[PDB]
Design a protein around this ligand. Structure first.
Ligand SMILES: *[C@@H]1O[C@H](CO)[C@@H](O[C@@H]2O[C@H](CO)[C@@H](O[C@H]3O[C@H](CO)[C@@H](O)[C@H](O)[C@@H]3O)[C@H](O)[C@H]2NC(C)=O)[C@H](O)[C@H]1NC(C)=O
Ligand SMILES: *[C@@H]1O[C@H](CO)[C@@H](O[C@@H]2O[C@H](CO)[C@@H](O[C@H]3O[C@H](CO)[C@@H](O)[C@H](O)[C@@H]3O)[C@H](O)[C@H]2NC(C)=O)[C@H](O)[C@H]1NC(C)=O
Ligand SMILES: *[C@@H]1O[C@H](CO)[C@@H](O[C@@H]2O[C@H](CO)[C@@H](O[C@H]3O[C@H](CO)[C@@H](O)[C@H](O)[C@@H]3O)[C@H](O)[C@H]2NC(C)=O)[C@H](O)[C@H]1NC(C)=O
Ligand SMILES: *[C@@H]1O[C@H](CO)[C@@H](O[C@@H]2O[C@H](CO)[C@@H](O)[C@H](O)[C@H]2NC(C)=O)[C@H](O)[C@H]1NC(C)=O
Ligand SMILES: *[C@@H]1O[C@H](CO)[C@@H](O[C@@H]2O[C@H](CO)[C@@H](O)[C@H](O)[C@H]2NC(C)=O)[C@H](O)[C@H]1NC(C)=O
Ligand SMILES: *[C@@H]1O[C@H](CO)[C@@H](O[C@@H]2O[C@H](CO)[C@@H](O)[C@H](O)[C@H]2NC(C)=O)[C@H](O)[C@H]1NC(C)=O
Ligand SMILES: *[C@@H]1O[C@H](CO)[C@@H](O[C@@H]2O[C@H](CO)[C@@H](O)[C@H](O)[C@H]2NC(C)=O)[C@H](O)[C@H]1NC(C)=O
Ligand SMILES: *[C@@H]1O[C@H](CO)[C@@H](O)[C@H](O)[C@H]1NC(C)=O
Ligand SMILES: *[C@@H]1O[C@H](CO)[C@@H](O)[C@H](O)[C@H]1NC(C)=O
Ligand SMILES: *[C@@H]1O[C@H](CO)[C@@H](O)[C@H](O)[C@H]1NC(C)=O
Ligand SMILES: *[C@@H]1O[C@H](CO)[C@@H](O)[C@H](O)[C@H]1NC(C)=O
Ligand SMILES: *[C@@H]1O[C@H](CO)[C@@H](O)[C@H](O)[C@H]1NC(C)=O
Ligand SMILES: *[C@@H]1O[C@H](CO)[C@@H](O)[C@H](O)[C@H]1NC(C)=O
Ligand SMILES: *[C@@H]1O[C@H](CO)[C@@H](O)[C@H](O)[C@H]1NC(C)=O
Lengths: 1026, 49
């Protein structure tokens, strides 16, 4: 039987308390939704690889006992756990498989301890792990409902005990004791752990409440990468994919330059004993396999080198000595061994980096009468130096008297050769011995081996090697024309691009295994859980054959695009607004095409339109909308202060004295940050403090129907802000601050408090609504808001009569616009994106800075205190200086990023100051500067580290067609409109303003004369009143 | 071209026909490598036979 493990196989990774923190771990866990074996134990009257997760839900404690080992037959040590009524007993010994075991031999360690395990069934979760000879056991007891077959539910297993088990473990078994055998059946669950990366969520109590398997599905991969349980709708770049190579191929030239070492093995007569000949070969190829294949031998023992080792080791100055010796003298030449021949004929150095090969030579050297030609000398002045030969025939005085002349009593220089006979000498028969030594100690290398190659593969990623040039990828037919001296080809980027086969002189291109970006496209995690996967710049004929999660690699949804391919969304022919941009004009959405799914499509650039252009057709608007639009501008950012001493050094005197050497760097960093903070204050002053005096709105708020109650301050609230200002303040969200403060990263408060910023804004509002643009230039001059509105209308080329004749309508439009602003700000949280993401950037920068303190930067650890405690000053300081360099580099990176961010914030603040000067303090003519349409006025509103402009704009609407002429000819002379345009309703002609349909009688006042009507193209005929 | 670097003695050569207007005419050509020998001896002075 089998089933799926939903949320089981989770434990506390280490004995450490945490709280309200999402922690990422890499350890042995049971993967989520895994193939868990449902065992049933029934009587008729398992491999332990990378830990085991064991679950039991049976009653009456029926399942009692565990076995772990490699053989479990008392040949090798075994681990056994057994439980009964009162306690639990553990052994690690060789038990012969008390019905459990027969005999106890070689027993070394046993453990006796507290009990572990004490119709609603209960789960008894156990986890067994074995790492570097340490066996950790984890457990948990959880009563549940009846049956439920591994229900939905999460809980982690606390550790109980760890065992120092020093034996290889391969298989584990369960045992149980039963009460004539009673018939019975039971059930348990077995799961296998893998090296996985998990994300654990800790509650306020520090209990692991929930987990995410990062390496299960793309959605959980995005969850683990963002370190959050909720993922906002969009596209997120996850870990990069690379198709792995298939095999390894090695290419070398054909076999050349052979060592003729067979001939010296096949020599008719070998070198003498006392007069051994020394020989050296180099610059060829030798093998040991063929050496004992062609020339078989049985008497050989080698010192310091493995028989297989000689084949791959590359010689320059190898010493070879071959001679015929007696079988009993074959083993006597070993260094430090005493003997007549060793001390007076030939011996090897103590540091003999070599080995001996011996074989029989009786049948090739011995005669019937004996070979009396292998003469030697078992007499010398002393123990001769290693690798020395002597042929000087000086008489040796062996006896007590100076034996001189031809001979003496038992005195002679040479000795008669051994009676070398085939059968008579049992171990005295001659043997040929060759001693090969390789005490090289030299730069050149000559004699290594044929350096064997393998078969050639093509059109497939491989680990290719060409005469030491190593790489990975596919090979293809080469169009390059090499030259005989050229071997491989490089490109502009100094990388290998084409290589020639050293065996046969054919050349192939090199292209490493195709790869690209992996992106996950998701809607809101709350909205849905199905995701799409984008493979960037990879042809998706390759990923399906590349089928760690590869479930989606052979999905029925594949769409190919310029950006790459998309899997998990269906391409559709119709075009919508872009929601999630994919790239190269492809956008993804989540909709029902009634079941909802992810789709991909070509983005629409807006509704198709054809402007009704003609010779003489104009469209004139007859109505307008007073559109009030919010423009959010960041003005300042959180003024940050950092002290080197607190951050870089954990209040250590030694670290402080080592850091004082970098005083220049620290003063530069402090100067840069102080400059940034003073610049933030200057930004706020330049944007807001543009008024010499603080103006006050009158108690009578009568502005000809315009209602400024939502933007003017309300005395009720303690901080005298407005309704809209309060909404903006609530929308932006401004512990980790305590940790930042404790690590020496402080936030200096702005010079201007939110109260005085609101007071500056209120002064600007009062000046704007009571004086208009005049308070910007010089002394504030009072003017009714109606006539200021008439002036703003006159500014955009609309005659002031329009506003006075529609005063109530414009006032109602403005009020409804403010109402819509209030509703939009109250409803959605996406309004103040810019200020919120600025705050998020600053918070992320500070969090990254605090997190880099965990990096060791190649030191022993990331904490100075343990370094000081565990190290004597010199090694302590040689670690601490590296740590200081790392942390100073992190601080420099932070300060540089802050300088660039402060430059962009200063650009935004200069733009905000320009907008306050040109939109608030006056009416701007710059198109689309102070909002979309014809700008009328603006209202500043303070917001957390920024400003909001309520750009009031005139937008024409309800346009209609008219017939138009460039000029009028009345009395043979052309007439032109003073300021407006000629239009005809079909019968009569009229002069009108260009932004509001208002026809007027064509008279001498609104028109001026110029030349005659035979030059202007498109002039028409009409009459002009005096 | 005769070189010796890290005990490795390298020979480069090239063969060109000329009308023998005069010694070392105007022209461009490179010397393709022929043989490198791992000699590893001291070279300071050289002579032509
Ligand atoms: C220019 O556009 C104005 C709207 O942008 C438009 O105002 C609209 O006028 C109509 C009729 O005068 C109103 O319609 C409603 O009138 C009353 C409420 O006052 C209702 O009882 C009726 O049933 C009807 O629904 C609109 O309410 C009003 N819109 C606004 C925002 O006030 C002007 O009339 C237009 N001017 C010209 C010259 O076309
Ligand atoms: C300017 O606009 C203001 C908001 O649109 C408006 O204030 C609003 O006034 C109305 C009635 O005058 C209030 O409506 C509520 O009045 C009482 C309050 O106890 C309730 O019992 C009623 O049921 C009703 O809900 C709004 O509460 C009030 N809104 C705010 C935000 O204060 C001003 O009156 C407008 N200015 C002028 C001159 O009229
Ligand atoms: C195009 O514009 C024409 C010029 O304004 C317009 O003609 C005008 O039409 C109105 C009635 O629709 C006339 O108004 C007078 O009508 C009678 C005439 O006897 C009087 O008794 C009334 O009291 C009223 O004053 C205008 O007299 C007339 N303009 C002229 C100069 O005669 C056309 O109707 C417009 N046509 C279209 C299709 O838009
Ligand atoms: C964290 O543990 C505390 C106990 O130390 C929990 O507080 C009690 O929880 C029980 C069961 O949930 C309630 O019956 C009590 O009313 C709680 N006591 C108090 C004073 O609130 C607390 O609920 C746990 N928190 C979480 C998130 O599980
Ligand atoms: C897969 O890789 C590229 C990328 O799609 C393929 O190149 C396209 O091939 C199709 C059909 O032959 C053409 O219509 C496109 O114009 C090609 N585009 C580009 C950018 O090259 C290529 O044919 C496929 N196979 C291989 C081996 O690359
Ligand atoms: C001005 O007149 C033109 C043409 O007389 C109008 O354009 C037509 O609009 C209708 C529906 O909007 C289409 O079915 C026609 O194909 C259009 N014709 C042309 C030639 O473009 C235009 O709508 C009129 N202007 C306004 C503001 O309505
Ligand atoms: C505007 O009216 C004038 C006359 O009042 C037109 O001028 C005449 O045009 C015709 C045809 O080209 C000529 O035969 C006459 O000789 C012109 N008379 C004069 C006095 O110039 C003129 O054509 C009209 N405008 C247009 C655009 O037709
Ligand atoms: C579990 O594995 C067995 C054999 O290894 C297989 O027969 C069975 O279908 C698998 N079950 C699941 C749910 O994958
Ligand atoms: C449990 O078993 C141990 C030995 O394995 C023994 O010492 C102990 O007496 C047993 N207790 C009971 C209650 O069976
Ligand atoms: C294991 O026990 C056997 C007795 O059968 C003994 O010969 C051997 O020396 C023991 N080995 C160890 C390592 O204790
Ligand atoms: C290597 O030997 C093979 C086997 O016949 C031959 O085809 C190939 O041409 C040889 N290459 C060289 C460089 O000798
Ligand atoms: C996700 O949707 C739920 C309702 O289904 C809503 O309560 C929640 O606010 C949404 N998430 C976010 C981040 O707004
Ligand atoms: C888009 O239209 C073409 C023909 O115009 C058709 O072949 C194709 O199947 C359509 N796309 C989809 C996703 O059905
Ligand atoms: C626009 O005026 C020119 C001037 O001669 C004329 O040729 C053209 O036909 C006119 N356009 C149309 C659409 O009639």
């Amino acid at each position: 039987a089998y089933t799926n493990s939903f949320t089981r196989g989770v434990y506390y990774p280490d004995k450490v308390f945490r709280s309200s923190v999402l922690h990422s771990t890499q350890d042995l866990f049971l993967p989520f939704f895994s193939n868990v074996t449902w065992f049933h134990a029934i009587h008729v009257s398992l491999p332990f690889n990378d830990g085991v997760y064991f679950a039991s839900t049976e009653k009456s404690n029926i399942i009692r006992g565990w076995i772990f080992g490699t053989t479990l037959d008392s040949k090798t040590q075994s681990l056994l756990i057994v439980n009964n009524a009162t306690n639990v007993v553990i052994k690690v010994c060789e038990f012969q498989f008390f019905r459990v075991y027969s005999s106890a031999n070689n027993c070394t360690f046993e453990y006796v301890s507290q009990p572990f395990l004490m119709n609603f069934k209960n789960l008894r979760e156990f986890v067994f792990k074995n790492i570097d000879g340490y066996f950790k056991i984890y457990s948990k007891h959880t009563p549940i409902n009846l049956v439920r077959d591994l229900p939905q539910g999460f809980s982690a297993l606390e550790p109980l005990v760890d065992l120092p088990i020093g034996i290889n473990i391969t298989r584990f078994q369960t045992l149980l004791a039963l009460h004539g055998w009673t018939a019975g059946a039971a059930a348990y669950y077995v799961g296998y752990l893998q090296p996985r990366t998990f994300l654990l969520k800790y509650n306020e109590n520090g209990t692991i409440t929930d987990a995410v398997d990062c390496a299960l599905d793309p959605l959980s991969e995005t969850k683990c990468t963002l370190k959050s349980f909720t993922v906002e709708k969009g596209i997120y770049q996850t870990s990069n994919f690379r198709v792995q190579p298939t095999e390894s191929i090695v290419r070398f030239p054909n076999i050349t330059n052979l060592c003729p070492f067979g001939e010296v093995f096949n020599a008719t007569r070998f070198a003498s004993v006392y007069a051994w000949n020394r020989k050296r070969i180099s610059n060829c190829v030798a093998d040991y396999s063929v050496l004992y294949n062609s020339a078989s031998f049985s008497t050989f023992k080698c010192y310091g080198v493995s028989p297989t080792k000689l084949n791959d080791l590359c010689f320059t100055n190898v010493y070879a000595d071959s001679f015929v010796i007696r079988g009993d003298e074959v083993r006597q030449i070993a260094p430090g061994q005493t003997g007549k021949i060793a001390d007076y004929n030939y011996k090897l150095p103590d540091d003999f980096t070599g080995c001996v090969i011996a074989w029989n030579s009786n049948n090739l050297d011995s005669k019937v009468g004996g070979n009396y030609n292998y003469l030697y000398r078992l007499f010398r002045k002393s123990n001769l130096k290693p690798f020395e030969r002597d042929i000087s025939t000086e008489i040796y005085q062996a006896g007590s008297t100076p034996c001189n002349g031809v001979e003496g009593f038992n005195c002679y220089f040479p000795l008669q050769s051994y009676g070398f006979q085939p059968t008579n000498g049992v171990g005295y028969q001659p043997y040929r011995v060759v001693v090969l030594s390789f005490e090289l100690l030299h730069a050149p290398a000559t004699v290594c081996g044929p350096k064997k190659s393998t078969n050639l593969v093509k059109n497939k990623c491989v680990n290719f090697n060409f005469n030491g040039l190593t790489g990975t990828g596919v090979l293809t037919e080469s169009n390059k024309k090499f030259l005989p001296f050229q071997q491989f080809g490089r490109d502009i980027a100094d990388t290998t691009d084409a290589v020639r086969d050293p065996q046969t002189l054919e050349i192939l291109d090199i292209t490493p295994c195709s790869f690209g970006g992996v992106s996950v496209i998701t809607p809101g995690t709350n909205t849905s859980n199905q995701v799409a996967v984008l493979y960037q710049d990879v042809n998706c004929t390759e990923v399906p054959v590349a089928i760690t999660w590869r479930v989606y690699s052979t999905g029925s949804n594949v769409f190919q695009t310029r950006a790459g391919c998309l899997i998990g969304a269906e391409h559709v022919n119709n075009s919508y607004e872009c929601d999630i941009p994919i790239g190269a004009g492809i956008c993804a959405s989540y909709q029902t095409q009634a079941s909802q799914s992810i789709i991909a499509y070509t983005m629409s650039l807006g509704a198709e339109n054809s402007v009704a252009y003609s010779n003489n057709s104009i469209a004139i608007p007859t109505n307008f909308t007073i559109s009030v639009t919010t423009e959010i501008l960041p003005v300042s950012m959180t003024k940050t202060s950092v002290d080197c001493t607190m951050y870089i050094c954990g209040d250590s005197t030694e670290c402080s004295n080592l850091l004082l050497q970098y005083g220049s760097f620290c003063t530069q960093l402090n100067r840069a940050l102080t400059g940034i903070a003073v610049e933030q204050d200057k930004n706020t002053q330049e944007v807001f403090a543009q008024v010499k005096q603080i103006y006050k709105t009158p108690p009578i708020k009568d502005f000809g129907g315009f209602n400024f109650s939502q933007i003017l301050p309300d005395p009720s609230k303690p901080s005298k802000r407005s309704f809209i200002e309060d909404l903006l303040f609530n929308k932006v969200t401004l512990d980790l601050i305590c940790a930042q403060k404790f690590n020496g990263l402080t936030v200096l408060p702005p010079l201007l408090t939110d109260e005085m910023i609101a007071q500056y804004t209120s002064a600007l509002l009062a000046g704007t609504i009571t004086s208009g643009w005049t308070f910007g230039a010089g002394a504030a001059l009072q003017i009714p808001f109606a006539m200021q509105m008439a002036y703003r209308f006159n500014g955009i080329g609309v005659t002031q009569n329009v506003l006075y004749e529609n005063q109530k309508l414009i006032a109602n439009q403005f009020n409804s616009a403010i109402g819509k602003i209030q509703d939009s700000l109250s409803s959605t949280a996406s309004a103040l994106g810019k200020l919120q993401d600025v705050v998020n950037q600053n918070a992320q920068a500070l969090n990254t800075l605090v997190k880099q303190l965990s990096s060791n930067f190649g030191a022993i650890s990331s904490v100075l205190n343990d370094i000081l405690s565990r190290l004597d000053p010199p090694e302590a300081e040689v670690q601490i200086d590296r740590l200081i360099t790392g942390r100073l580099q992190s601080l420099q990176t932070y300060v540089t990023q802050q300088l660039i961010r402060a430059a962009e914030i200063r650009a935004s603040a200069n733009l905000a100051a320009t907008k306050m000067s040109e939109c608030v303090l006056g009416q701007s003519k710059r198109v689309d500067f102070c909002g979309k349409g014809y700008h009328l006025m603006s209202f500043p509103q303070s917001a957390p580290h920024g400003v909001v402009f309520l750009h009031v704009t005139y937008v024409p609407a309800q346009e209609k067609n008219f017939t138009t002429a460039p000029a009028i000819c009345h009395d043979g002379k052309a007439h032109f409109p003073r300021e407006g345009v000629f239009v005809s309703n079909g019968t009569h002609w009229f002069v009108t303003q260009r932004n509001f349909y208002e026809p007027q009688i064509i008279t001498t006042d609104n028109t001026f004369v110029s030349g005659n009507c035979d030059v202007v193209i498109g002039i028409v005929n009409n009459t002009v009143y005096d």
